[PDB]
Amino acid sequence: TPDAVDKYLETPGDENEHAHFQKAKERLEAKHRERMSQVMREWEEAERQAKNLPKADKKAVIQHFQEKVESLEQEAANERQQLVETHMARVEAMLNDRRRLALENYITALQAVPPRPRHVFNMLKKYVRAEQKDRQHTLKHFEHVRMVDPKKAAQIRSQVMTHLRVIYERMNQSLSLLYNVPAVAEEIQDEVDELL
Amino acid sequence: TPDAVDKYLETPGDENEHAHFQKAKERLEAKHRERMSQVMREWEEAERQAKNLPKADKKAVIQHFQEKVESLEQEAANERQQLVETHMARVEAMLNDRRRLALENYITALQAVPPRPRHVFNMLKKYVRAEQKDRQHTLKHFEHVRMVDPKKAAQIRSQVMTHLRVIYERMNQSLSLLYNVPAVAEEIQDEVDELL
């Protein structure tokens, strides 16, 4: 019952996550090797048997396993891609809260009446950092559309490239925040471009 | 000059192989991360700059990097698939010699005038084993057509599924060899089916 994928998909948010993901891929792959060998041994028994038969039957037999194999190897390719895509999403969620928490701070510092320039930066590097870690991870996801099957792969790529463009704009929007507090801007500026 | 892929492709047959392959994937991936970050940092500088410009320019800029990224991530996906496919071939070569050497023996034993049944099996398990290890590895290759891009992926699958069918027939042909020496067949038979 609790299938490798079923389990993973049912125990989310996890703090240990990465473990689940590896335990997941490692456990699914194992089982796969099982069924795969079960079908391959099976295929032989079928050949040796039907051997003293017509080309029509021998051949037809081969067209059975050839197809049962293509059938499982596919479902298998999908279960994996199921794991990756879920995981990939759960990390995104994490990285996103981090992006959020750093910004709620950068805004916190930005608003202090005696705008301690030194602080703005402190809280901003943490924002720009997270944003960057997200930038990076979104890319990792893009590249993980390797098994590219339907147009789902092209659809995802578009969803990835799309969020990738947001990440940027939303940071530049966050950076435009300095203009409203035209002061800390100078003490921070030249330093800002350095991080960039 | 000696590109990660260039090097790998130029130092074959290797006995250490696996090392080359890992050193290869590890070194290509590293460099990739480099160019990728170079383009991502670059993209920002371009945004912050062109920011105080029209939607036409800002947007167009984004259409530059969006495309330069898709451009590199692809070439990158191809260089990798280049490594895998080469490696995958070189292993096949290896496993194939093993398939050969075991058969030259199984035939050697099969031909001894005083057909020592006990030996035929000894040399045959080694054949059927190799053949099986090949069976397995061909499958690993099939599943490694994950990045599926053009119809190259479908073309390869067909080449894989094709060799997969040969592996079988050629073993059953090798097994049919027992019939010509109708003797060792009985002492070996029931035992034969057990390995199967």
UniProtKB/Swiss-Prot annotation, chains A, B:
List of residues that carry Phosphotyrosine: Y127
Sequence segments annotated as region (Collagen-binding): 153-170
List of glycosylated residues: N172
Domain E2 per the UniProt entry, residue ranges: 4-195
Tissues and organs where the protein is expressed, per its UniProt entry: Expressed in the brain and in cerebrospinal fluid (at protein level). Expressed in all fetal tissues examined with highest levels in brain, kidney, heart and spleen. Weak expression in liver. In adult brain, highest expression found in the frontal lobe of the cortex and in the anterior perisylvian cortex-opercular gyri. Moderate expression in the cerebellar cortex, the posterior perisylvian cortex-opercular gyri and the temporal associated cortex. Weak expression found in the striate, extra-striate and motor cortices. Expressed in cerebrospinal fluid, and plasma.
Location relative to the cell: Cell membrane; Membrane; Perikaryon; Cell projection, Growth cone
Residues found modified as Phosphoserine: S71
Region (Heparin-binding): 21-53, 121-152
Induction: Increased levels during neuronal differentiation.
Modification comment: Proteolytically processed under normal cellular conditions. Cleavage either by alpha-secretase, beta-secretase or theta-secretase leads to generation and extracellular release of soluble APP peptides, S-APP-alpha and S-APP-beta, and the retention of corresponding membrane-anchored C-terminal fragments, C80, C83 and C99. Subsequent processing of C80 and C83 by gamma-secretase yields P3 peptides. This is the major secretory pathway and is non-amyloidogenic.
Recorded coiled-coil stretches: none
Family listed: Belongs to the APP family.
Record text about domains: The transmembrane helix undergoes a conformation change and unravels partially when bound to PSEN1, facilitating cleavage by PSEN1. The basolateral sorting signal (BaSS) is required for sorting of membrane proteins to the basolateral surface of epithelial cells.
Disease named in the record: Alzheimer disease 1: A form of Alzheimer disease, a neurodegenerative disorder characterized by progressive dementia, loss of cognitive abilities, and deposition of fibrillar amyloid proteins as intraneuronal neurofibrillary tangles, extracellular amyloid plaques and vascular amyloid deposits. The major constituents of these plaques are neurotoxic amyloid-beta protein 40 and amyloid-beta protein 42, that are produced by the proteolysis of the transmembrane APP protein.
Subunit structure: Binds, via its C-terminus, to the PID domain of several cytoplasmic proteins, including APBB family members, the APBA family, MAPK8IP1, SHC1 and, NUMB and DAB1. Binding to DAB1 inhibits its serine phosphorylation. Interacts (via NPXY motif) with DAB2 (via PID domain); the interaction is impaired by tyrosine phosphorylation of the NPXY motif. Also interacts with GPCR-like protein BPP, APPBP1, IB1, KNS2 (via its TPR domains), APPBP2 (via BaSS) and DDB1. In vitro, it binds MAPT via the MT-binding domains. Associates with microtubules in the presence of ATP and in a kinesin-dependent manner.
Miscellaneous remark of the record: Chelation of metal ions, notably copper, iron and zinc, can induce histidine-bridging between amyloid-beta molecules resulting in amyloid-beta-metal aggregates. The affinity for copper is much higher than for other transient metals and is increased under acidic conditions. Extracellular zinc-binding increases binding of heparin to APP and inhibits collagen-binding.
Function of the protein: Functions as a cell surface receptor and performs physiological functions on the surface of neurons relevant to neurite growth, neuronal adhesion and axonogenesis. Interaction between APP molecules on neighboring cells promotes synaptogenesis. Involved in cell mobility and transcription regulation through protein-protein interactions. Can promote transcription activation through binding to APBB1-KAT5 and inhibits Notch signaling through interaction with Numb. Couples to apoptosis-inducing pathways such as those mediated by G(o) and JIP. Inhibits G(o) alpha ATPase activity. Amyloid-beta peptides are lipophilic metal chelators with metal-reducing activity. Bind transient metals such as copper, zinc and iron. In vitro, can reduce Cu(2+) and Fe(3+) to Cu(+) and Fe(2+), respectively. Amyloid-beta peptides bind to lipoproteins and apolipoproteins E and J in the CSF and to HDL particles in plasma, inhibiting metal-catalyzed oxidation of lipoproteins. Promotes both tau aggregation and TPK II-mediated phosphorylation. Interaction with overexpressed HADH2 leads to oxidative stress and neurotoxicity. Also binds GPC1 in lipid rafts.
UniProt name for this protein: Amyloid-beta precursor protein
Organism: Homo sapiens (Human)
Gene assigned in the entry: APP
Shown stretch of the complete protein: 371 to 566 of 770
